[PDB]
Amino acid sequence: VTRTAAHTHIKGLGLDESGVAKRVEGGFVGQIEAREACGVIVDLIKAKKMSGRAILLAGGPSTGKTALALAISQELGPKVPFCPLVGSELYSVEVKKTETLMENFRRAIGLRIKETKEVYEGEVTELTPEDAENPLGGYGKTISHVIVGLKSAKGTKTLRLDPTIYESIQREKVSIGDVIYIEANTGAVKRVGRSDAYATEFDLETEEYVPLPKGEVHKKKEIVQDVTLHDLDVANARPQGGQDVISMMGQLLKPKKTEITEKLRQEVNKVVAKYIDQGVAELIPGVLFIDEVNMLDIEIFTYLNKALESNIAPVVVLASNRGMTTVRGTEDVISPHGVPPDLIDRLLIVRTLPYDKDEIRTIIERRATVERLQVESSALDLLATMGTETSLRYALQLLAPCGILAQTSNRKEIVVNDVNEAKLLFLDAKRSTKILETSANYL
Amino acid sequence: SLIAAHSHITGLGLDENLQPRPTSEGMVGQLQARRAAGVILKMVQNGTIAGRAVLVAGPPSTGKTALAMGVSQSLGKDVPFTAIAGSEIFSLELSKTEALTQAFRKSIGIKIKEETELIEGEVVEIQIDRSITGGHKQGKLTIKTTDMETIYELGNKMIDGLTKEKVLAGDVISIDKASGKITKLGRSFARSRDYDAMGADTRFVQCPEGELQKRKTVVHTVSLHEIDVINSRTQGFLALFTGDTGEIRSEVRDQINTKVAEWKEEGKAEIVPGVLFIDEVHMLDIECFSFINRALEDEFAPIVMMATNRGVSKTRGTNYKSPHGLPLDLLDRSIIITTKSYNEQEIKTILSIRAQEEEVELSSDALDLLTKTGVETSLRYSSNLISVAQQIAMKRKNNTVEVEDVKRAYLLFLDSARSVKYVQENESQYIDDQGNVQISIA
Amino acid sequence: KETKEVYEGEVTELTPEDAENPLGGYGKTISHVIVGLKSAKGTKTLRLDPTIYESIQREKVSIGDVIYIEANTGAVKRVGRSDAYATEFDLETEEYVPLPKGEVHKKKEIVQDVTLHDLDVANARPQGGQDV
């Protein structure tokens, strides 16, 4: 019925009201101290007071660092902006990597704004232009004003549009009998479509038919909008939305990332602080998650050192499988987790421990129940021994071939023969490497 | 089309119990890998399991891409199969992660149901009112069937589709309302007044009867990547063919994901998953491997099959060596299908299948010589020798291919080992690794 | 391989014949366009569609020009002026093409050799989008 992925079974951190961690709840098994530390970090984010706080999730492969990051994102809720990222994603061919890191920093900071929109909506009854007396002067246009009549439910009024607003009208291909929607904030026009007051069975352009809009024309409506600081930065860097020719030609150009200057970011911060001071918008700081932080080179770490000291930077969480490894882009800088000690000093390392046999067994059981599979107890024990022998991920990813082989033989349960056949058909990394070492023609 | 190297593979050759036949649908041998590929195919056809990494490993000339093409042939239609190599990711206009994201989203299909009105009938009258510059176009179309006759209002696009493939009165045409398709079925009037302008010789079509408007439901599949490219900018439909989709932002991807979830919850659209096949996966960088590791854990992630033919080799972008050229965290997320070499009988059956596909008649002793050559040197070498032996036999003005044609083709075209021996015996005649050569005879 | 059926030649007259009871509120409602084409040893009077007439205004076709019409599409093509119609003896920038040979009505089978990359290049770019 429902499509499942690697982290579908996790609903959150699963903590008590005192911050302690129940052993098996919230889709989580084990990692009690790591879940408690992540809950403390979640409460720090919900305080909405600090800037540039950075922690590091450190542990081996298949230990649940990305699981903890997804649990943090689920416990924070959909309102808090969560920006998942890989260390390899910052290498862009359009713009420098530091600009991409700053763009993700601004993308992780959110804003909730109440916006008042002045709206002229209604069905077009008459649309008559008034021509200019000298059409070919080269300084004005062919028309001077346009009279347009709009009727809503229990209301009718006429508008005298300048040629810019009429240009926005006629680019939507507005004719007589169209319910339209003019937004006075930007001059943007939405053509809602044909009115149902006329015949609706004689068109060929699969149009929708709408009733007359309720209320009067020229309404003022309040909309709650959730944006980010990066949305404002990319809207002001590439201006679209006005009816001037720069906005309209910039609509049609191919979009391309640019190095957004500090002046534009400071001006956007000033406008956002003015929105907050009038009490019309609220700031929601969020989380930037960087999995495989070992992929960053020394320049991104150096820029991270400066960017974490900003007064608007979000909470940045990182993950790494590395031990004592050289930093990328360097030669001899051996560092823990592939992260240089200048950034490690700004970090709070959260350790993540490996699992036991019974924890692996109940993780396999929960992944089987979230995938709607029935496994026998002996087959579950063999899956647990296979997980302790080869890998946890190999035992989790062998459940679906076991289900395929079970439904092939017209069974709902997964017998020991099914998991033996799936072990024979599909190989882990260690058995494949043992085949590689004992082969001649480079298997 | 033409005969390629995998044209004989028309599927996987498996029963309803996922058991491979010894020779079926152009596939012979490799029973365990074929059974594992059938399990993978059933997992794809279930559609409820997302983001699983599958690695196909083995020596060269064994059947990894043959198994992938068998999966693709058994996959069925309206299911995506994005077969790329590891060298397409390295681009000048796209990042490695962005190219990998586009390859991931090309493999996820969306089946959309649309409601369509079909209007087939004879045209009574076309009235087209156009502006002085020809920009604004409107008008009416009086159309008719043998029961009733209606008048429709025409838009700009319908008039533009009426001007091309010029519809006169008395023409039986079909109107597809949901797609804006104008199909001139023909002419039914055959008026005596004939103009000297047109060279149209439209066939006579009988007058359509019944109702004029017929409601129907159409079903079409559009990939995810098409939806992000279309919604990314204004002229995204041009960028679907030019490929000028430079680094689509993540906001577009998030909004497209929420919109397609809303389309799934409305019953308008459904999401079908497909297979992303990556041939020569050892060519990817370590950054690509890390991005694949984190992108496999997505809801909109397809089944990823990878093929490599390398042992413990150097991983690109690093300074160490890893099994299959892939790091251990990627191999932790993958289940490895192992493909083994062939014996004499499997090579003989493959060569017989390839000769039957290429319309080449072989004798028994010629097939035995080709099997012995394929065992000794390479299966691909004998499969390439089949066609030139057929050309030699047709040059000798005989229909079938004899032993001496295969021997002549073996003498004319060299394999790897014979060329290596000829180069090593004549080392001074060739440019070495130090750029030294003796061109002069004396 | 394809079939091209064309009428080309120096033109002799351009009479946009008006219709009987020609509606109201419009000037010169055209019932059909009569075009008199001539070439070597051939001369044909053609009764064209009215909607070719604006194409007559589009390519600036006057009496004495050498024009070229495909039968299937009905699009005119002003090749140039006739060599005999070099009336402006002193100064003119017209391209005076010779009068075309053979009959006016010619239907010929032509063969075009392209590559698949040519088709990919021609299909990639917007074919006559007519936008900015």
Binding site: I176, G177, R194, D196, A197, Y198, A199, T200, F202 | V123, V124, E125, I126, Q127, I128, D129, R130, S131, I132, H136, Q138, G139, K140, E153, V167, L168, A169, G170, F189, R191, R193 | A19, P22, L23, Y26, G27, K28, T29, I30, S31, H32, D49, P50, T51, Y53, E54
Partner: peptide
């Protein structure tokens, strides 16, 4: 009852009328 047709305004626009017998191009 029956809903009325949408008002069709074609003032100042050239007309191309294709009928069973003759075709007309009412231009300006």
């Amino acid at each position: 009852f029956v809903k009325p047709r949408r008002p069709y305004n074609s003032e100042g626009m050239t007309r191309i009328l294709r009928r069973y017998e003759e075709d007309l191009f009412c231009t300006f």
